Amino acid sequence: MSPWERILLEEILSEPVRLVKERVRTHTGRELTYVYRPGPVAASFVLPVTERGTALLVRQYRHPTGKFLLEVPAGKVDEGETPEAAARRELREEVGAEAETLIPLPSFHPQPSFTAVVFHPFLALKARVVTPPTLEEGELLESLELPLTEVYALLAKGEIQDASTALTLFYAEPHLKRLGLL
Amino acid sequence: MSPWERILLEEILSEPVRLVKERVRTHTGRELTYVYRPGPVAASFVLPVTERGTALLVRQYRHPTGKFLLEVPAGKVDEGETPEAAARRELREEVGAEAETLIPLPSFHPQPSFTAVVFHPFLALKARVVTPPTLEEGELLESLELPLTEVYALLAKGEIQDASTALTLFYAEPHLKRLGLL
């Protein structure tokens, strides 16, 4: 029941990111070219909290912005992998950590006007570093540990620029207070 | 002081969205191809609240997701336009509304791994419909009015799928409580 009809779907790029340019007939009966990153595609985000009430985060270079941003560990869900498995895998790769319970938080689309990607946030409890990180070529980041009170102060001060990290923190807050970690 | 050095920047598309494919030399001294939507580019998001404690939102088709999403009015900042002016302009175009004070909320990057875009959220007070909407070809949406209590119930229930709308609501909440609108 799509309101727009496909006329022609052209692949503009296949790797490292698939991008398409689609000519469609809109609700006005006119034609329009829409450019986007097609689905199905997803990524998992995980706020790793330790038993000491601290969070394991990453300070990561994000080339398009030219900045190093404070973010929760996160990454693309591989083919046939569940969001929870991707969350645990990226946590291990980026911070060298493992966790016990992973509480699922509301999923969201970071930029639905351009990409079909769905981001799956999680709150990981009893997070602990157990091995050295294993980063891919392309990943420039350092892991760090911050008291939850400081992380939420930064959030309140509007200093968390990565939207997904900020949203994950907002969704995690009530759970953290309930669990007595915040 | 960029950690990555440009080898060659190729434009893959100029319109309707500019996209580039850049070959860079990374921190490992190796080469990598990075694909992204270059800056400077921005959009403004505005939560329009009425004097009756309701919010003016839009139910908008987002083609990449194939869904109609509940969002706050928002749009691209045009060349040489300020974020506040874009917020007021898109509010007028999409909902046919005007507002009095616009309180700036923390700006954020929706997906820094892929786009340089910065989103500028605002809380608009005394919002009121004054004219019919003026939508562009490409915009398929309907405006609606919901009590703030219902909007925040939806947020708490994890039903707000658009990340920017969800984050704008979280940042706006303390202000709304302070002002006595929530």
Ligand SMILES: Nc1ncnc2c1ncn2[C@@H]1O[C@H](COP(=O)(O)O)[C@@H](O)[C@H]1O
């Ligand atoms: N837009 C992009 N262009 C090229 N590589 C990307 C892009 N987005 C993410 N990557 C790469 O994918 C890798 C791992 O990402 P992640 O699964 O998100 O933790 C990194 O090394 C990135 O460089």
Ligand SMILES: Nc1ncnc2c1ncn2[C@@H]1O[C@H](COP(=O)(O)O)[C@@H](O)[C@H]1O
């Ligand atoms: N990725 C895209 N490809 C083609 N058109 C787009 C894309 N993203 C946004 N637009 C168009 O830009 C218009 C107004 O957007 P906005 O300023 O965001 O409210 C809409 O009519 C959209 O169809």
Ligand SMILES: [Mg+2]
């Ligand atoms: Mg990652």
Ligand SMILES: [Mg+2]
């Ligand atoms: Mg990965």
Ligand SMILES: [Mg+2]
């Ligand atoms: Mg990774």
Ligand SMILES: [Mg+2]
């Ligand atoms: Mg818009």
Ligand SMILES: [Mg+2]
């Ligand atoms: Mg616009």
Ligand SMILES: [Mg+2]
């Ligand atoms: Mg618009």
